Amino acid sequence: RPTFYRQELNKTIWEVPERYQNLSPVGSGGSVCAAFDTKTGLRVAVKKLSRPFQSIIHAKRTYRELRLLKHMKHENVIGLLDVFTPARSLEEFNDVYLVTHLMGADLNNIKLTDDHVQFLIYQILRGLKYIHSADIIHRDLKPSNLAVNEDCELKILDFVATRWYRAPEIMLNWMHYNQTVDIWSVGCIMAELLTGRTLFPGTDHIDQLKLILRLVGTPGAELLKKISSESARNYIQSLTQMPKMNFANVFIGANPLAVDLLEKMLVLDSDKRITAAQALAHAYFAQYHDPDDEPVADPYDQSFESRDLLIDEWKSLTYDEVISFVPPP
Numbered sequence: 001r002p003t004f005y006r007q008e009l010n011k012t013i014w015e016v017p018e019r020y021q022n023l024s025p026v027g028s029g030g031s032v033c034a035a036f037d038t039k040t041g042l043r044v045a046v047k048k049l050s051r052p053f054q055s056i057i058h059a060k061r062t063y064r065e066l067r068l069l070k071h072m073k074h075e076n077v078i079g080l081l082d083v084f085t086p087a088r089s090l091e092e093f094n095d096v097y098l099v100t101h102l103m104g105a106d107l108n109n110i111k112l113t114d115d116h117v118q119f120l121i122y123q124i125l126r127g128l129k130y131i132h133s134a135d136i137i138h139r140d141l142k143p144s145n146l147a148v149n150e151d152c153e154l155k156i157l158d159f160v161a162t163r164w165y166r167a168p169e170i171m172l173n174w175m176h177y178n179q180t181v182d183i184w185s186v187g188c189i190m191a192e193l194l195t196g197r198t199l200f201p202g203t204d205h206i207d208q209l210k211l212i213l214r215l216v217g218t219p220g221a222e223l224l225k226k227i228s229s230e231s232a233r234n235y236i237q238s239l240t241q242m243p244k245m246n247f248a249n250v251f252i253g254a255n256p257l258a259v260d261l262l263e264k265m266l267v268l269d270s271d272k273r274i275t276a277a278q279a280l281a282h283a284y285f286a287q288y289h290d291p292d293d294e295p296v297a298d299p300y301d302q303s304f305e306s307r308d309l310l311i312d313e314w315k316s317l318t319y320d321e322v323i324s325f326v327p328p329p
């Protein structure tokens, strides 16, 4: 065990190892401080989880979160530098702190040149290929979930309405949506980077879908055959039929290859959207694409998601993950 020190930071105590110095509050959801990591010489972000073990739900969320962050090992996905607790045993274990690279800013704080959009969208797809290869769905892709440093290097995390980037099938509350909902979000972000405007700034879920169908058109026959819900079908079929808009007209002035890729990402029927791996080979990324440097992820065991355990059990599991953590090289 290293040596800890305690300080108060905005009605919130912090007990961190001496390796982390000069803590400076940085914003809240858990609470986060900037620090300097004396072991590496790097600026780090330290998140203290709040009430990680208050309820079975929080406890399982805490475990979720730590297992996920321990597994993500890719240049365009947030990685875990360190995890620690000031607790000396399972008995006294109550607090969890996560350490990551301090990221410059988000995508939210930044119309962009076509080459900038190429590189940023490339990095998102490259990270998402990786995430999707472990059978994870991000589900919350939006500019504020993308950290971008001054070199335009990009990492996906999960800390402007979320709903504006959500796939129309989620708006429709389809129970079996899949990983292509993330590709939808990337299409919405890409559009926003090209035009400087939110593509679908819906005020709620009804308005969200309405704006979506305005661009992409009402469901064709092939898609309507896949809808099980009678109510959803009455809704859909009762709408004034709209054709898919011409994306060339709508995005006139934008690189035709960016237009082509948007067409491939924002297809209404999710079975027809381009995957992340396919999008990487798209001609729009010829500057960047390297098929031998787009790794997939180690197998990821998410079987714990189906399990119903006591709070102390999820707490014990989390402690095990804390203790087993091996820092990155």
Ligand SMILES: O=C(NCc1ccccc1C(F)(F)F)c1cc(-c2ccncc2)nn(-c2ccc(F)cc2)c1=O
Residues within 6 Å of the ligand: 032, 045, 046, 047, 061, 064, 065, 068, 069, 072, 077, 078, 098, 099, 100, 131, 138, 156, 157, 158, 159
């Ligand atoms: O907290 C989170 N990030 C920020 C973070 C972390 C550590 C150290 C300092 C910070 C600071 F300082 F940047 F916030 C985070 C949490 C959860 C999560 C997951 C499941 N349940 C609950 C929460 N997931 N992702 C995530 C990662 C990759 C991905 F593809 C999708 C999401 C996160 O980045």
Ligand SMILES: Fc1ccc(-c2c[nH]nc2-c2ccnc(F)c2)cc1
Residues within 6 Å of the ligand: 168, 169, 172, 173, 174, 175, 219, 223, 226, 227, 228, 229, 232, 236, 268, 269, 270, 271
């Ligand atoms: F108005 C609509 C109708 C269908 C969608 C949709 C897009 N991709 N997949 C679906 C879908 C598939 C199976 N069942 C559902 F309920 C939805 C989105 C909005």
